[PDB]
């Protein structure tokens, strides 16, 4: 029925409505609820390991490849303009103000934005997440608070590591394989950086959709209905949305500052 | 396999083995190839039936849709044993008039 079809559409409207409402409530309860008995900092260490460190080889190799691609594209894009040696101010400006954090999102939100949702989803599905209450610990502070903290304090560091490896790979292909001159590269690069105005720009950009990624990437895991199909669908909702939001907030955050 | 015969005057004879293989051919050669020509009062009697699965059940079933659609009335005689049981399971208690 078309009228009831639109009824279902509107029900989905109110559904995402109440969804992110409940999400912000969840986030509040998690970051500022109380202090639980069985918490600490070792939790944060274990998480930060599972979320950042394990997801580090991926972004290292990905930074390598995307950097040398950025080079092999800039060299050939610009040799048609003579200003070949200026490739440094490209491979280090695009890889540092916009593409750096965007790809770092789409990868972090790819792996650690998912195997983080499936983790606390599975937890909810084997009731493990529930027996915590019957014990007495608040899960939203023992199970998910270290997730959020491993998010906020990993993805920015990951973006930095990615940008570094990207620039270095771009140089290594440009210097050794393209043949452009050694010192000229870093020279034009440092002459065209504007630290507080591009580097810090990219870092605040990284942090904001670090927060946004590992916010949904954990909420979805907390909300998914407990069944092996439910989790299998939540760990896809949290890639759809974690990429949508990465790019959307990249766009807004770059309209705030060109 | 099995076969169909003896039309236009009731007494629909049914041969031995009604399986998934021999199914459709019998359906088509009975439903229109025979039930278009009948007079009335179709006695379908399963005398010389060797062995049949639910496919035969659904066959004698389709034998009834057309006859009802053909206006004329029909009934079954000499229902075999295995058919009797395959009807017993999925009730078909009276829907198989004998």
């Amino acid at each position: 029925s078309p009228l009831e079809r639109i009824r279902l559409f509107g029900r989905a409207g109110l559904d995402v409505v109440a969804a992110l409402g409940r999400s912000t409530l969840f986030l509040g309860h998690a970051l500022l609820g109380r202090r639980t008995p069985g918490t600490g900092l070792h939790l944060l260490v274990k998480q930060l390991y599972s979320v950042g460190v394990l997801s580090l080889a991926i972004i290292v190799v990905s930074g390598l490849f995307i950097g040398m691609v950025l080079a092999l594209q800039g060299y050939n894009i610009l040799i048609s303009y003579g200003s070949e040696q200026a490739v440094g101010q490209m491979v280090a400006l695009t890889l540092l103000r916009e593409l750096g954090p965007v790809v770092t999102g789409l990868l972090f939100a790819g792996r650690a934005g998912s195997a983080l949702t499936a983790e606390i989803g599975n937890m909810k599905a084997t009731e493990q997440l529930s027996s915590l209450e019957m014990i007495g610990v608040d899960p939203l502070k023992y199970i998910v608070a270290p997730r959020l903290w491993a998010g906020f304090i990993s993805m920015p560091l990951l973006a930095a590591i990615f940008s570094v490896v990207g620039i270095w790979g771009g140089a290594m292909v440009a210097v050794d394989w393209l043949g452009v001159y050694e010192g000229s590269f870093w020279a034009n690069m440092q002459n065209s950086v504007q630290f507080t105005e591009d580097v810090l720009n990219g870092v605040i950009k990284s942090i904001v959709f670090a927060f946004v990624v590992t916010w949904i990437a954990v909420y979805q895991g907390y909300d998914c209905e407990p069944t092996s199909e439910g989790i299998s669908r939540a760990t896809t909702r949290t890639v759809v949305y974690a990429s949508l939001a990465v790019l959307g907030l990249d766009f807004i955050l770059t309209a705030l500052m060109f | 396999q099995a076969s169909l015969r003896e039309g236009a005057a009731g007494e629909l004879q049914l041969a031995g083995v009604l399986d998934y293989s021999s199914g459709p051919a019998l359906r088509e050669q009975g439903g229109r190839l025979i039930r278009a020509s009948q007079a009335a009062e179709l006695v379908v009697d399963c005398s010389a039936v060797e062995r049949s699965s639910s496919v035969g059940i659904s066959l004698l079933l389709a034998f009834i849709r057309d006859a009802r659609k053909a206006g004329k009335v029909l009934s079954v005689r000499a229902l075999p044993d295995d058919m009797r049981e395959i009807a017993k399971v999925s009730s078909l208690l009276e829907i198989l008039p004998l």
């Binding site: 008995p37 084997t126 009731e127 529930s130 027996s131 209450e133 019957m134 014990i135 | 849709r65 829907i95």
Partner: protein, 262 residues
Amino acid sequence: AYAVELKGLTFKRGSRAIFDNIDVRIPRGKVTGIMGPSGCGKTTLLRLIASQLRPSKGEVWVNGQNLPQLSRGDLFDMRKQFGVLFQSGALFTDLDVFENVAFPLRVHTQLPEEMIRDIVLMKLQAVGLRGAVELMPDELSGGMKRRVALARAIALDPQILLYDEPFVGQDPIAMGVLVRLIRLLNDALGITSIVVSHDLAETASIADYIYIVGDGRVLGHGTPDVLKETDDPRIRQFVKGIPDGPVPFHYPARDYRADLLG
């Protein structure tokens, strides 16, 4: 006189009215096993009487006070009284067996890290999983993966404890050891235990005052005997095989004649 009583309790999940002005009254010291049809809301009753799920209205008297009307600082202290054993164990995949069993102690009590080890060890011996004090539950065979959970429950020596479908889907050796333990804990430790199992046979075997929960209303209750001949059509259909009765066998079809013919 009673360990747990549920006065005027009702619950609705999205106004679905899961529980509807119910009254259950558990006797202490006696293994009572509640159960009911599919989707009848048992586990909901568990998380209720364990105060993980906030009731809509009513009160849950538990060894004295009622829970939904307690202060967090006191509710947490009450948590020391009741243990819960889910099916599928519900172990923390993060921590090994030993830390997993110790967890409730490391939460509600401040003991010398040796003494915690000794309590954990004696409990694990009581349940038999004393050897695998190093395995991670990921490494642990799905059977004992439940007995370790039981040991974690009986830690702190709670006076009552809940069982969410304990004997469901395991070889009768594991089912046998588990049904021996859930009864040993009651015969010795004198702790109220609330089995919650779809399995009628073993439940009615061991239980003392079984209930039957259906569509938001307790569908009667009794000791196994009175329940075996209640003659209430709904119940007598449940507690026996008798597939056709108040709960229909067939789905609401239209007609076995017309639909197949027209």
